[PDB]
Amino acid sequence: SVTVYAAASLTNAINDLEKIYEKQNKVEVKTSYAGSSTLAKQIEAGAPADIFISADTQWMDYLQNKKLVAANDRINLLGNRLVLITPKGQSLNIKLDKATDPNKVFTGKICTGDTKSVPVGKYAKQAFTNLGWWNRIEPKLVETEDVRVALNFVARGECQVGIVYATDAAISKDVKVAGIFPENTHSPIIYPLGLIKKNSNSAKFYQFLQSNQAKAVFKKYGFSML
Numbered sequence: 001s002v003t004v005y006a007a008a009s010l011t012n013a014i015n016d017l018e019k020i021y022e023k024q025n026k027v028e029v030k031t032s033y034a035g036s037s038t039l040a041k042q043i044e045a046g047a048p049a050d051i052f053i054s055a056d057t058q059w060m061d062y063l064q065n066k067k068l069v070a071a072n073d074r075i076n077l078l079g080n081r082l083v084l085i086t087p088k089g090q091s092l093n094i095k096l097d098k099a100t101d102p103n104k105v106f107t108g109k110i111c112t113g114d115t116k117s118v119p120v121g122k123y124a125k126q127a128f129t130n131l132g133w134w135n136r137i138e139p140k141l142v143e144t145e146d147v148r149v150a151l152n153f154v155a156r157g158e159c160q161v162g163i164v165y166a167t168d169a170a171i172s173k174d175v176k177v178a179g180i181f182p183e184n185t186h187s188p189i190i191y192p193l194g195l196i197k198k199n200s201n202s203a204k205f206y207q208f209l210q211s212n213q214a215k216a217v218f219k220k221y222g223f224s225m226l
């Protein structure tokens with residue numbers, strides 16, 4: 001068997017590839033999804049993950065610095081974009097530009113991941129700072145421990161808007177995109193793939209995630225191949 005810990009934004013793609021790999025190999029693939037921060041900390045505490053996929057470089061560096069992944073056993077796999085979402089039926093179009101006043105466009109709460117630890121929230125905080133919006137945005141936040149909890153809060157109408165990845169908006173018929181953050185507002189969204197346990201089964205799955213077959217699933221879900 002092989003145990004894969006993956007950022008919550010990767011739930012649907014990795015579930016699809018788990019099914020494909022189990023049809024092609026006599027190996028069992030076990031998956032665990034959560035915020036990249038939670039998963040890295042769990043690995044640090046001894047969780048038996050063979051493979052880790054983070055939604056930012058920071059949480060893979062965190063493991064590298066603890067010597068839990070080698071520089072040569074990680075690769076940048078996927079990219080994404082950062083988006084604003086609204087519940088379906090409460091559509092908006094908001095330009096993510098310093099000229100926009102967040103106090104006039106955001107008249108309720110704003111749902112995203114914890115801005116200090118969950119990658120989606122860290123990317124969001126970079127963007128708000130670059131836009132000069134941080135001190136007006138912070139009082140509006142509801143912070144969650146992964147991007148999918150935030151997505152669900154928006155789908156259920158507990159927040160007027162949310163900040164999730166483009167791939168999250170596309171997976172949910174209950175939310176719609178209200179704005180795309182320009183790339184120059186934040187660090188590039190990069191998913192490093194890391195081989196944590198070096199054994200025969202884990203190495204095959206690590207390679208499989210880079211394969212032509214895996215590229216097609218990731219592209220289906222809206223990710224970019226790096």
Ligand code: MOO
Nearest residue numbers: 007009036120147
């Ligand atoms: O680690 Mo996530 O995909 O930003 O919740």
